[PDB]
Amino acid sequence: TVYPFESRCIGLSSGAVHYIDEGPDDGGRETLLMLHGNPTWSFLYRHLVRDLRDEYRCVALDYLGFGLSERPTDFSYRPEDHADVVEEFIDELGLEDVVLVGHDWGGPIGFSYAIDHPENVGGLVVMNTWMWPVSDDKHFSRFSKLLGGRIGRELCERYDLFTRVIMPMGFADRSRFTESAREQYRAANRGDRTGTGIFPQAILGSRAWLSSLWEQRDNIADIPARIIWGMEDSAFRPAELRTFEALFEDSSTVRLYGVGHYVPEEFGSDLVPLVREFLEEV
Amino acid sequence: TVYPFESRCIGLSSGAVHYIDEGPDDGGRETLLMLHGNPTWSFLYRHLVRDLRDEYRCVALDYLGFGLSERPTDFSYRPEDHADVVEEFIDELGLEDVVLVGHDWGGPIGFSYAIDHPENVGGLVVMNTWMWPVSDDKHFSRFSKLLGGRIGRELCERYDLFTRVIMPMGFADRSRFTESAREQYRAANRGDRTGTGIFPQAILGSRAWLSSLWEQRDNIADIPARIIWGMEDSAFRPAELRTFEALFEDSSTVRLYGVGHYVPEEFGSDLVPLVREFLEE
């Protein structure tokens, strides 16, 4: 009722993935690929997909271990493996020219794709992301340590902490977190919670990867971009917003008010125009 | 005994300033200008000046309302006015080609000089600075609100909070905060404490200025630079360190261990080589 969109599935060498694919299959137009955050599903972008659909092909991907995708028992939830999932997916769908849209963890993954394959990137839109090692922001660091490590995994697997508490925590307005959205995020089972439990640990251990991506920003600078930041966000500070603008040449920042971490769900109605303007301009 | 360096004074249109000026007066060599943080004096860089002196002319400036400088009763402690103090000072001393070194508040001020007059800047070294509006770092924001506003001013003027507590708070190793350093910082009088009390408020209200400087970074990018960051700092996060490196073309970051906010005092012995290498390269 809420998610009427056509759903499809790709078998990848590391496991099958679910995706949403709206708009024409006649790919004479640019494709936009959406990458979700944690513990979210591609459903996070239901509104964004709905409206962008009539102008651009819109594809949204569920990461392995999340959403409606396969969860190999040996999958390592390193950003490197998530990047490989995205890369193979883009090739499997024939998506030769793609604008990437990423949120939270999806930021660094879309960014990484663009670093490795800038040739196939038609532009980048990032929102409330985890790009760059986070060393100074004590809010995140304290949560990362609690939600990471052994205790992290146990908290996620035993209590679904990451969905029952942390998800609402990231909303400036929890009345927009509809029961259906809450159900689908909580629909993930106990085994799926392992991938979620690992995520913040992956950030703590992926600092070398994030640092490498930062160093390669001078090359990603040739790809047009937009950075969306909520005024009440927890994953990104205005200091970072300004620093990223200073480095990522040919980019622009957007500040959204009355919005937290989960921007596309609370303010999808503003995100749509921001993305459409980007897609129209370049 | 601790600060043997020759001291001089310039009358500026906004008040007189004190400065340290070491090395030859025969300016056939590059000059390095050091800008202090808060509530510090140019004494912060005594070690850095001592060693750089024999290779480069070293000048260190006390900001109006701080150190051994004049405190006009109408001085506005906006970064804009501090930048004008630095600009006029550089012109008054004939310092035609200057490498700027800034810490804390001195960061944005040296940076601003470079934005307005990149032509006179031989390079930039910044350490634990307040560049860019700070919106996400709740540690600073909570202190800014406490140390800023009316209560901020009262806390500084009545209790010298900013020197008795905040200064030691910024050290990873307080045993390096010698009694002489402690005395000189605390030597500032109650009226001088007003300038100090305003500082964090100036940051909260100067966000437009800091934002403008950030936007002009694409032009400052033509000036070689180094960014020094303490692993236990409170004014700057590694996220920012990485972002600044990404934007400031022709720059490099340095991470110092076992050091807090007041880097040149705790680890002056590492800062000297970092600055000398920059100046040699």
Author numbering:
A (entry chain B): 26 to 307
B (entry chain A): 26 to 306
Show passages lifted from the paper.
Here we probe the structural organization of DhmeA, a subfamily III HLD‐like enzyme from the archaeon Haloferax mediterranei, by combining cryo‐electron microscopy (cryo‐EM) and x‐ray crystallography. A distinct catalytic pentad forms the active site of HLD enzymes: a nucleophile aspartic acid, a histidine base, a catalytic acid (aspartic or glutamic acid) and two halide stabilizing residues (two tryptophans or tryptophan + asparagine) (Janssen, 2004).
The cryo‐EM data collected on optimized DhmeA sample showed particles with tentative threefold symmetry. The resolution of the final model was limited to 7–8 Å which limited further data analysis. None of the focused data refinement strategies led to improvement of model resolution which suggests that wild‐type DhmeA forms a highly dynamic assembly. No individual secondary structure elements were clearly defined in the cryo‐EM map, with the exception of a central eight‐stranded β‐sheet that could be unambiguously located. The structure is built from three DhmeA dimers, which are arranged around a 3‐fold symmetry axis. The dimerization interface seems to be tightly packed, while inter‐dimer contacts are less tight. We therefore deduce that the dimeric unit is a common building block of large assemblies formed by wild‐type DhmeA.
